[PDB]
Amino acid sequence: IPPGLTELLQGYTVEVLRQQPPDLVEFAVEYFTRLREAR
Amino acid sequence: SHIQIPPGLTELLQGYTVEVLRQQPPDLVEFAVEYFTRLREAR
Amino acid sequence: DAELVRLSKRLVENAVLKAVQQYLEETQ
Numbered sequence: 001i002p003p004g005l006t007e008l009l010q011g012y013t014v015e016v017l018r019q020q021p022p023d024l025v026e027f028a029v030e031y032f033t034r035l036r037e038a039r
Numbered sequence: 040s041h042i043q044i045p046p047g048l049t050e051l052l053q054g055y056t057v058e059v060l061r062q063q064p065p066d067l068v069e070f071a072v073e074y075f076t077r078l079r080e081a082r
Numbered sequence: 083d084a085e086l087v088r089l090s091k092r093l094v095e096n097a098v099l100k101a102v103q104q105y106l107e108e109t110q
Contacts, residue, residue, distance in 0.1 A: 001060075001089075002059060002063070002067055004067055005056070005059065005067060005093060006093060006096065006097050006100075008067055008068065009052050009055075009056065009093065009094060009097035009098070009101075010098075010100050010101045010104070012052070013044065013048065013052070013097060013098050013101030013102075014101045014104055016044065016045070016048060017042065017044065017101065017102070017105040018105070024045065024047055024048060024051055025051065025075055025078045026079050028055075028075040029072060029075045029076055029079055032068055032069075032071035032072045032075060033072050035068050036068045036069050036072060040109075040110060041106075042105060042106060043102075044098060044101075044102070048098065049094050049095065049098055052094045052097070052098070053087075053090055053091055053094050056090035056093055056094050057087055057090045059090075060086050060089065060090055061083075061086065
């Protein structure tokens with residue numbers, strides 16, 4: 001089991017709960033893109 | 040105090056999670072962008 | 083590969099379960 005997996009999956013889901021996006025797949029691209037660029 | 044998540048979410052992540060385990064990518068966050076991009080692009 | 087699909091199912095189930103718990107305990 002890769003380190004950082006559970007945290008990752010949870011973070012996404014929490015943002016889906018906060019923002020209620022219409023397209024989950026496309027919101028995923030954006031959420032994970034923001035995560036990679038956030039450093 | 041009850042909420043819920045849309046349908047598709049858990050299966051969406053299951054699919055991502057499955058491929059992570061199979062391929063064992065070095066960078067999980069960028070693998071996600073790639074994995075999910077394909078989904079978006081597949082139509 | 084069958085055990086891989088079952089494992090991923092749990093991890094997700096766990097992550098979502100905690101994501102719900104977090105959002106409820108974050109709003110109130």
